[PDB]
């Protein structure tokens, strides 16, 4: 069930289609992964059209004593970094190269076979109509109120995914349409930018009787389950999870989304032990209007979320992180003392209770927790103006390189062990394919091999 590119004859209609939408510009095509890759290859076949690139690639062949794959790597790693797609002496020279690249070389690209190939891939993208036959479904890996989550392979590329499959009957029966759709909106806002610390969405589709989210596969269970098996974590182990989560929150806050349900059961591990924030059903967009409602899990909600009538924003999440990091070190939320099932008492504690930190805690850790758990939003870490940057700058993360955190170069502390009619109208607009995600999927699976096969035909 693999991919078949349409024949080159679609070029005229496709080129015109995109021109009418003003999408045949350097900024539009170059910022797409598949556009970048094909434009890169065009440049590399016709280096003469970019004066500085000829001499450079002539010198590298002599320096490395080569026998094509290097050309691509050097373009991606070195050339792109130096040109970027604090004042620099070479600024006018960077502009000259880039102006030639986005003008005369782009134009010649538009007129070449390589743009015909971009039109073919782009046509396939606009023809995505996902059903359950496009996936091969394996075992259950998660359960919830309206449905469950399965492991699966998408047939045409072979990429493994998680398929969150909500049952429409059960949604109707429990009167939770608004929240199922909220998850779809929230995922849509968050799943751009390619972030490694959030369980993002690639596709959404629906059947007669099921809503389906295709999501990043997280195979290794959640931090709640692992905390009960491992026991509490040291400061060194918790730092790893904290750093990765702080970057997940930064990403969400940058897109004006408060998450509101930050807690260990909502932190999933992959098979390597790296983590992502999952379940955005309770998250809220705060770009237009700030939410007031008390939403979350009781030992994890911030004072401003609980206080009656007070508006709140991303500030909530930093407090929730404070509660959650304490839970990883101590086995319980700070404001749930003796495994209480008294929600009123937990909330009173959240506002009034002085959190007693043991001597074993380092002063650096105390600084962090006392910062995150500030009850006034005006004095809390993360809320003084500069967001996640203020939290990264804590002395608990003194020795971390945040670039390496982002790139996932730090070793994880725990490696999981291997092994009616009107109602259907509500779910129109539910189908979505996030372009960036599909292109990334194609790039990393079958792009090269389909291009070679097509080139032969
Ligand atoms: O509708 C739901 N929840 C609604 C709700 C929430 C809170 C209280 C009342 C109702 C619902 C439905 C299926 C599952 C889950 N949560 C588990 C989960 N979420 N993502 C994964 C996952 C597993 C592997 N890989 C990637 C993702 N697993 C919640």
Description:
The chain starts with 10 loop residues before the first helix and ends with a helix. It has 3 domains: 8-127, Helix Hairpins, CATH 1.10.287; 132-217 and 420-434, Phosphorylase Kinase, domain 1, CATH 3.30.200; 223-407, Transferase(Phosphotransferase) domain 1 (Transferase(Phosphotransferase), domain 1, Orthogonal Bundle). The protein is an alpha+beta fold and 457 residues long. Strands 1-2-3-5-4-10 form a 6-stranded antiparallel β-sheet. The protein has 20 helices and 10 strands. The structure holds ligand 8PV. Ligand 8PV is lined by residues 141-142, 144-149, 162, 164, 166, 199, 215, 217-218, 268, 278-279, 281. The PDB classes it as transferase/transferase inhibitor. Keywords: Kinase, Inhibitor, Heart Failure, TRANSFERASE-TRANSFERASE INHIBITOR complex.
